[PDB]
């Protein structure tokens, strides 16, 4: 009982400490910045190869090829410029909820409700692709997968845990456990030295791949959060939740910085992504469309309404030339 | 233009044809979801038919291909992955009929049935309900009255009407009686005739779907 009171006192002390250094009034700091006006985006291409709802999509460092996964037990690599399909990998367990594309371009990792992470070898002799390694050890369901190197992969599973693996041996190198609920998202920093994860506790934690110990804990959401994306500078990130609000946190200030909400938006968000310059914020709602938020003024810029169902994924090219949105409509479009 | 990209286009067309064939073959079949309480009757149902996270069971009966998804081996928030099963043909629910006195189990089973039936995604799919351990229920009623778990029950302690009362109590839990149907059956360890009941339910569901898609409904 006394120990719980001590923990509560520590929490109150932390809250007071972060409140003492909180003279932000940021809307009074950037109120003189000219608006970005109105942003008009028109669809440029449509990839029609899937026969079911798609749940994942990841661009490549080439910024030309991308991968997408759906529930028909197939993930196919697209050629965005020409709309041709490069590969069509038949996967064993049709229940897949995430996918990843290696930065070098040699590997593709997919995993879902089957509690196993599968890594496929793209560039190899004998022609077709092959399953390089199957990763086992989790007890929930894989929510997100990101690549650090060609030998290291970080996974986010449904059993309130995150892990770091090595492909050559298939063993859990490091395990992160500080959450009290299912973790749904994950995003690596540009320098690949640390990452943040968001769980069903309406709290986001900041880990680091070196020691495996949590650094800071962020909170302020009223419901489950589903999307996380780092700022291009690497000192901030934005989160989306079922609360129908998007908010931006700061690592150095260690507290909330913005809230993005509107009166006529009462539905949650499944995807959040930033622009190359960081001045625009892309959020994918379940209202069958995604909006563009001016990240420095919390003012809406444009609306991208071209889908007949909720969007389950969203990504921006590495050079920031185009944005691709996928939905349960089974068609994913490219906007520019 | 298109110096050697013609071969790439041909490869894309060929893999698209393969995708079309695979999609047609996958759409030819029907999928079944098996829910139920913890180790109530789900074990013996799978054994009656020919037959990690989840396990998929493949079997055929009278020129029809069935796929059964046993998702009970996953411990997590159900609301975060239950939308992946939208569009399933039917839901199989197993209830232990002889566990009416051991523990409260019947009340939590009814709560689970209420949660599953009135879900936001399953507002249209039909439900097939199985009441296992019928033989074991015969010997546990004459000694232990059914009033233990049903205080409002007032009737003779006979199996013939107690089973009907339990069936009605399970069946009247759906708030949408004009859109979805509930098929109730009594199953024991022997008398392997449940596959015919499943076939009849799936045939009715397919007929309704064909009528809906044909413009008549």
């Amino acid at each position, epitope marked *: 009982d006394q120990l719980r009171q001590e923990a509560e006192q520590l929490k109150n002390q932390i809250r007071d400490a972060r409140k003492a250094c909180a003279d932000a009034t940021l809307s009074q700091i950037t109120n003189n910045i000219d608006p970005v006006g109105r942003i008009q985006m028109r669809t440029r291409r449509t990839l029609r190869g899937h026969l079911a709802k798609i749940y994942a999509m990841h661009w490549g460092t080439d910024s030309r090829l991308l991968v997408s996964a759906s529930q028909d037990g197939k993930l196919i690599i697209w050629d965005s410029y020409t709309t*041709n399909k*490069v590969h069509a990998i038949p996967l064993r367990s049709s229940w897949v909820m995430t996918c990843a594309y290696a930065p070098s371009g040699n590997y593709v990792a997919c995993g879902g409700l089957d509690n196993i992470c599968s890594i496929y070898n793209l560039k190899t002799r004998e*022609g077709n692709v092959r399953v390089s390694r199957e990763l086992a050890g989790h007890t929930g369901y894989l929510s997100c997968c990101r690549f650090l190197d060609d030998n290291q992969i970080v996974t986010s599973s449904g059993d309130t845990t995150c892990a770091l693996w090595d492909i050559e041996t298939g063993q859990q190198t490091t395990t992160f456990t500080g959450h009290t609920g299912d973790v749904m998202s994950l995003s690596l920093a540009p320098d690949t030295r640390l990452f943040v994860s968001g769980a069903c506790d309406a709290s986001a934690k900041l880990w680091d791949v070196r020691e495996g110990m949590c650094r800071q804990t962020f909170t302020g959401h009223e419901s489950d959060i589903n999307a996380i994306c780092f700022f291009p500078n690497g000192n901030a990130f934005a989160t989306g939740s079922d609360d129908a609000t998007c908010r931006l946190f700061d690592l150095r200030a260690d507290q909330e910085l913005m809230t993005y909400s509107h009166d006529n938006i009462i539905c949650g968000i499944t995807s959040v992504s930033f622009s190359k310059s960081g001045r625009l914020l892309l959020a994918g709602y379940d209202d069958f469309n995604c909006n563009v938020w001016d990240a420095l003024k919390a003012d809406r810029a444009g609306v991208l309404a071209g889908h007949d169902n909720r969007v389950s994924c969203l990504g921006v090219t590495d050079d920031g030339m185009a944005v691709a949105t996928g939905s349960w409509d089974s068609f994913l479009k490219i906007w520019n | *233009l298109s110096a050697e990209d013609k*071969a*790439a286009v*041909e490869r894309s067309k060929m893999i698209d044809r393969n995708l079309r064939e695979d999609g047609e073959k996958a759409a030819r079949e029907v999928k079944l979801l098996l829910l139920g309480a913890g180790e109530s009757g789900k074990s013996t149902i799978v054994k009656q038919m020919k037959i990690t996270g989840i396990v998929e069971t493949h079997f055929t009966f009278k020129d029809l291909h069935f796929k059964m998804f046993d998702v009970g081996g996953q411990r997590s928030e159900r609301k975060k992955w239950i939308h992946c099963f939208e569009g399933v043909t039917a839901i199989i629910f197993c209830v232990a009929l002889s566990d009416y006195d051991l523990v409260n189990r019947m009340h939590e089973s009814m709560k689970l049935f209420d949660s599953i039936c009135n879900n936001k995604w399953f507002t249209d799919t039909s439900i097939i309900l199985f009441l296992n351990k019928k033989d074991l229920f015969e010997e546990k009623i004459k000694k232990s009255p059914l009033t233990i778990c049903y205080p409002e029950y007032a009737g003779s302690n006979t199996y013939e009407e107690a089973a009907a009362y339990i069936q009605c109590q399970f069946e009247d839990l759906n708030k949408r009686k004009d859109t979805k149907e509930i098929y109730t059956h009594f199953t024991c360890a022997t008398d392997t005739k449940n596959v015919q009941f499943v076939f009849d339910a799936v045939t009715d569901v397919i007929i309704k779907n064909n009528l809906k898609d044909c413009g008549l409904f």
Partner: single-chain antibody
Amino acid sequence: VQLVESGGGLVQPGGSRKLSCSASGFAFSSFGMHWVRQAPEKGLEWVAYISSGSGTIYYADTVKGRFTISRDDPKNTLFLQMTSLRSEDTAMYYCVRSIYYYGSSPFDFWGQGTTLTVSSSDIVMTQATSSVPVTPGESVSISCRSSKSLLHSNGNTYLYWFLQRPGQSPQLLIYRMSNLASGVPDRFSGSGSGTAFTLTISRLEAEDVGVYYCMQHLEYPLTFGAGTKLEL
């Protein structure tokens, strides 16, 4: 991977013969196939090509109407039917593997080859030289010229470099004039512009002597080069 050619021998003029290419160790049904023949003391020439799934077939001008090509995907075998043999068909025939997609490396493997003897608008590619004396440890340069600009509107220049060691089948070195094939040491390099190309070898050691061929792939038919020979 493993390719074996069989069906050689001596054929009287005006007869017929069948050549069988046996493919093993790789997915045959996903690869396109080519037939390339080499004269007894001359360079390589292109004969025929089959797309994936037998959906597209091309023939050379000098063999059109006399040669028939086909594949058997279930049995993993490639066939070439030869009719009305002349005295100019005496050569050695190679089975070539190829695959086309964004980022692929076609012409990456060549078969052993079979010997056959008979008793008695195109783009031309020119080699600057024909033979150069080479000392080990130095650097040499090989030039290649084309009658047409190989640069395309999509930003790709189609140029392939091949090296043939004595008594061995040629192997791919560089594709699209700038990329190094798998297993090739980083000593080799490629550069150049439209209608002007150059191959660079640095600190070359032994076992690098042979004939280097210059090949284009902008349009059919595919034309090889005369061949530059390197001698110690």
